[PDB]
Amino acid sequence: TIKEMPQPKTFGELKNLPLLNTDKPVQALMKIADELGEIFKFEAPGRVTRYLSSQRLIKEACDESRFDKNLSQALKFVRDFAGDGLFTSWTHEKNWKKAHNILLPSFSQQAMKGYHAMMVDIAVQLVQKWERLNADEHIEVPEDMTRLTLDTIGLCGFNYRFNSFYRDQPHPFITSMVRALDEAMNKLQRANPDDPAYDENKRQFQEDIKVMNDLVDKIIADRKASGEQSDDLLTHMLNGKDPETGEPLDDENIRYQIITFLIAGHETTSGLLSFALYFLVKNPHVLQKAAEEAARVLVDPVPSYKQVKQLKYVGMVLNEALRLWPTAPAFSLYAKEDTVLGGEYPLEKGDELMVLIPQLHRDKTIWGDDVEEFRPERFENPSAIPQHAFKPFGNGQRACIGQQFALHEATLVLGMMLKHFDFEDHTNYELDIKETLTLKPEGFVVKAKSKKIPL
Ligand code: HEM
Numbered sequence: 543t544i545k546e547m548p549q550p551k552t553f554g555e556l557k558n559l560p561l562l563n564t565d566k567p568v569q570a571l572m573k574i575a576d577e578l579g580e581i582f583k584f585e586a587p588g589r590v591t592r593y594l595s596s597q598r599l600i601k602e603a604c605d606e607s608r609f610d611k612n613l614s615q616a617l618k619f620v621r622d623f624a625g626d627g628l629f630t631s632w633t634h635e636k637n638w639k640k641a642h643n644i645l646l647p648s649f650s651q652q653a654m655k656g657y658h659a660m661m662v663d664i665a666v667q668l669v670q671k672w673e674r675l676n677a678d679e680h681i682e683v684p685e686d687m688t689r690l691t692l693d694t695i696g697l698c699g700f701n702y703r704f705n706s707f708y709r710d711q712p713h714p715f716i717t718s719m720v721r722a723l724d725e726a727m728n729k730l731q732r733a734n735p736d737d738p739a740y741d742e743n744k745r746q747f748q749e750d751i752k753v754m755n756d757l758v759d760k761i762i763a764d765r766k767a768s769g770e771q772s773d774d775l776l777t778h779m780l781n782g783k784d785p786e787t788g789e790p791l792d793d794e795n796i797r798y799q800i801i802t803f804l805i806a807g808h809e810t811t812s813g814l815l816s817f818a819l820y821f822l823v824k825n826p827h828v829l830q831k832a833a834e835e836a837a838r839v840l841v842d843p844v845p846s847y848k849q850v851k852q853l854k855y856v857g858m859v860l861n862e863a864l865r866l867w868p869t870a871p872a873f874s875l876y877a878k879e880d881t882v883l884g885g886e887y888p889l890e891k892g893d894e895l896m897v898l899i900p901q902l903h904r905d906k907t908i909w910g911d912d913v914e915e916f917r918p919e920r921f922e923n924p925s926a927i928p929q930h931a932f933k934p935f936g937n938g939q940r941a942c943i944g945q946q947f948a949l950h951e952a953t954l955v956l957g958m959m960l961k962h963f964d965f966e967d968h969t970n971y972e973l974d975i976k977e978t979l980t981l982k983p984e985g986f987v988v989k990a991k992s993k994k995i996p997l
């Protein structure tokens with residue numbers, strides 16, 4: 543039977559638009575999903591989308607014969623500086639499939655063996671920072687995790703050191719990138735974007751785009767000039783040819799890919815590490831089990847690629863953190879053709895869906911009644927998880943190309959953190975999830991007591 547779709551409260555001619563005029567729109571949409579269920583319509587002047595929350599419907603949304611990736615307005619604003627890089631391109635753009643084919647082998651699990659040493663370089667810098675704190679000091683967790691992930695992507699992406707652990711004020715590139723991302727997200731809630739109050743925003747935005755383009759174009763040009771071969775993604779992109787077209791990426795698209803790796807990877811990955819450490823300090827028995835694994839496996843001063851692969855419980859901790867607070871919390875799809883969703887909701891060609899990942903990850907028909915509990919052991923037998931129940935890295939050919947990189951990074955770093963320190967939730971921190979591009983536990987702080995194990 544065709545079913546009428548629920549809709550949240552309306553504001554006359556503004557329809558549902560004012561519901562997203564909030565500091566925490568994803569958390570607001572999760573509460574609407576709690577009230578309305580697995581699907582609801584969201585209307586604004588000149589647009590409609592449908593928010594999906596159940597595995598039953600998201601399994602169908604994930605059918606690539608029926609639905610393709612849509613660029614959300616969020617992605618369209620980011621496209622002003624990420625261009626036709628992989629994250630902000632339509633599947634049908636020539637540069638999407640070309641870059642996908644060229645870059646997939648450079649992002650495989652096997653390829654992580656080549657990035658491992660660079661990841662260890664930055665991870666050791668984090669450990670040494672914390673070893674060097676005085677008794678009276680604490681750790682700003684998301685702040686340090688972001689220094690780590692930015693620097694790791696910079697070193698593995700284009701052999702560039704942002705030297706974030708040497709600074710209070712980030713490298714100008716990072717200052718410009720973070721300010722451009724802030725501006726792109728701020729434009730989602732901006733009613734009068736041509737008001738003169740935004741003249742400075744528009745000028746600063748063009749300045750920040752030029753800062754990013756100028757540095758990355760220079761490093762590409764420096765690399766081509768020198769002929770130097772490194773273990774970075776820039777080497778792979780300069781050397782690569784798409785088997786289909788037989789073409790390489792041009793220098794402009796290479797620049798957009800480098801900017802994209804930093805944008806797509808830095809705050810998702812640092813949020814994952816921040817939420818994982820938050821859940822560990824709030825669940826001491828889970829922290830103890832993860833710390834026992836780190837001590838048994840990481841028997842050398844420097845972790846190896848093989849040792850990171852044997853941090854199985856650490857991997858389960860990270861998957862459980864992605865279950866509860868996936869740091870890229872939504873993605874957008876469009877209907878390729880007229881179709882019926884779930885035997886109940888007719889859609890026309892071009893109709894849009896939003897996947898509300900945190901709500902999917904709370905589907906009690908999949909996970910059971912204990913969905914709010916942090917229980918990594920629920921990932922012990924993953925073959926038992928029904929299709930499309932767990933989607934922190936998106937879907938299909940448009941899924942996260944960085945998934946293996948992010949998880950190798952996060953497993954290495956969390957393993958080293960748990961080997962080298964005991965952690966104290968010294969403030970009894972109250973979770974406050976700040977929403978920007980990403981989700982993070984705002985103001986999460988801990989104290990780290992060294993186990994005095996040499997590097
Ligand atoms: C260094 C780390 C990372 C890099 C370099 C990276 C890179 C990318 C790229 C290039 C894409 C676009 C793939 C394509 O469409 O061809 C993508 C998509 C995505 N990534 Fe990542 N990523 C990273 C980490 C993460 C993390 C940690 C998460 C989540 C916790 C995440 C979630 C996603 C999601 C959900 C998409 C799909 C977006 C959509 O459907 O619109 N990424 N990533």
Ligand SMILES: CC(C)C1=CC2=CC[C@@H]3[C@](C)(CCC[C@@]3(C)C(=O)N[C@@H](Cc3c[nH]c4ccccc34)C(=O)O)[C@H]2CC1
Pocket residue numbers: 562567568589613614615616617620730731870871872873896978979980
């Ligand atoms: C760039 C990547 C990393 C991101 C992807 C995102 C996808 C969905 C977003 C997002 C979570 C930010 C908050 C709004 C939300 C949930 C959304 O539905 N947004 C819809 C609907 C919408 C909200 N405000 C709008 C204003 C104009 C047009 C559409 C909208 C949209 O962006 O399309 C946002 C975070 C950043």
Ligand SMILES: [Mg+2]
Pocket residue numbers: 565
């Ligand atoms: Mg506020």
